[PDB]
Amino acid sequence: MDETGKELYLVLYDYQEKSPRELTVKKGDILTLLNSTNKDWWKVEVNDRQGFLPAAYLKKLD
């Protein structure tokens, strides 16, 4: 995706947003991390969109 040098996060499972701030994502999506100040809900970006997701849906790739 667009920007370079970013950590990549894999979405393990589909997630359907429960509020307008949240993201809807599909298994296999690749995300970047915008803000984590807790281990449970993160602000992330996928394909030009930004929103909140539960961190349990994500695996850091390395």
Swiss-Prot record:
Localization terms from the record: Cytoplasm, Cytoskeleton; Cytoplasm, Cell cortex
Domain SH3: 4-62
Domain of life: Eukaryota
Subunit structure: Like erythrocyte spectrin, the spectrin-like proteins are capable of forming dimers which can further associate to tetramers. Interacts with ACP1.
Family to which the UniProt record says this protein belongs: Belongs to the spectrin family.
Function as written in the Swiss-Prot or TrEMBL entry: Morphologically, spectrin-like proteins appear to be related to spectrin, showing a flexible rod-like structure. They can bind actin but seem to differ in their calmodulin-binding activity. In nonerythroid tissues, spectrins, in association with some other proteins, may play an important role in membrane organization.
Protein name: Spectrin alpha chain, non-erythrocytic 1
Organism (species): Gallus gallus (Chicken)
